[PDB]
Amino acid sequence: SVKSEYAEAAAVGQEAVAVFNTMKAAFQNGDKEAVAQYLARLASLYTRHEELLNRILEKARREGNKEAVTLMNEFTATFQTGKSIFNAMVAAFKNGDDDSFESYLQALEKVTAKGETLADQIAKAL
Ligand SMILES: Cc1cc(C)nc(N)n1
């Protein structure tokens, strides 16, 4: 069901949380080789999460589930804010700009924590 597809998407989201927190520790410790690998892992995870979310939104639309479509439109919009910040973080790492990396890292954390009430709302709506 679309509901079980959303639980699979939620797990991929939690995997990115886990890797992101490990990556933050590596960044603080100056282990740039680890950071590079974690950033590649996160890009793959976000790409997967984004695709699963789009399929869920498209299905909710085909089902006529108006409330779920509303919430998923809002949620995917916030997802893109996170993605833009993530991409900027990756660029800051490439450029050696640790000040911007720190800034983007904190912003991505706050964007992500803010989106969690909506994430739970969607599970109930599907
Ligand atoms: C990139 C991103 C953004 C938001 C709001 N939530 C998640 N899980 N991932």
Short mmCIF file of C-alpha atoms in Angstrom, two decimals, residues 56-119:
data_model
loop_
_atom_site.label_atom_id
_atom_site.label_comp_id
_atom_site.label_asym_id
_atom_site.label_seq_id
_atom_site.Cartn_x
_atom_site.Cartn_y
_atom_site.Cartn_z
CA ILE A 56 3.94 8.44 -2.92
CA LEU A 57 2.66 11.90 -3.87
CA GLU A 58 1.76 10.74 -7.38
CA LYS A 59 -0.11 7.76 -5.94
CA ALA A 60 -2.02 9.88 -3.42
CA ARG A 61 -3.03 12.11 -6.36
CA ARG A 62 -4.24 9.14 -8.41
CA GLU A 63 -6.20 7.92 -5.34
CA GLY A 64 -7.88 11.32 -4.92
CA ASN A 65 -6.60 11.58 -1.34
CA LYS A 66 -6.81 15.35 -1.17
CA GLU A 67 -5.55 15.75 2.40
CA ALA A 68 -2.58 13.48 1.79
CA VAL A 69 -1.75 15.39 -1.41
CA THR A 70 -1.81 18.72 0.45
CA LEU A 71 0.52 17.45 3.17
CA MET A 72 2.85 15.75 0.68
CA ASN A 73 3.06 18.93 -1.42
CA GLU A 74 4.07 20.85 1.72
CA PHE A 75 6.47 18.10 2.76
CA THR A 76 8.22 17.75 -0.62
CA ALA A 77 8.63 21.53 -0.73
CA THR A 78 10.49 21.40 2.61
CA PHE A 79 12.49 18.42 1.28
CA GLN A 80 13.81 20.62 -1.54
CA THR A 81 14.90 23.27 0.98
CA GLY A 82 16.92 20.58 2.72
CA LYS A 83 18.31 19.38 -0.61
CA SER A 84 19.44 22.87 -1.59
CA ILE A 85 21.15 23.35 1.76
CA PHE A 86 22.73 19.89 1.49
CA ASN A 87 24.10 20.66 -1.97
CA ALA A 88 25.52 23.93 -0.65
CA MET A 89 27.14 21.98 2.19
CA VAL A 90 28.79 19.60 -0.30
CA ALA A 91 30.10 22.61 -2.24
CA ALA A 92 31.48 24.14 0.96
CA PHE A 93 33.33 20.91 1.64
CA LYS A 94 34.78 20.83 -1.88
CA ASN A 95 35.90 24.47 -1.47
CA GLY A 96 37.41 23.97 2.00
CA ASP A 97 35.05 26.54 3.54
CA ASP A 98 34.53 25.11 7.02
CA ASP A 99 32.64 28.21 8.15
CA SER A 100 30.01 27.76 5.46
CA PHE A 101 30.00 23.99 6.06
CA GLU A 102 29.15 24.54 9.75
CA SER A 103 26.44 27.07 8.84
CA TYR A 104 24.75 24.83 6.28
CA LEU A 105 25.02 21.84 8.65
CA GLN A 106 23.12 23.65 11.42
CA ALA A 107 20.55 24.96 8.94
CA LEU A 108 19.92 21.46 7.59
CA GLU A 109 19.37 20.22 11.15
CA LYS A 110 16.80 22.94 11.86
CA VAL A 111 14.98 22.48 8.55
CA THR A 112 14.83 18.75 9.29
CA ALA A 113 13.59 19.02 12.88
CA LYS A 114 10.90 21.49 11.78
CA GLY A 115 9.55 19.06 9.22
CA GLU A 116 8.96 16.16 11.58
CA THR A 117 5.43 16.96 12.72
CA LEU A 118 4.34 17.03 9.06
CA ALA A 119 6.20 13.77 8.40
#
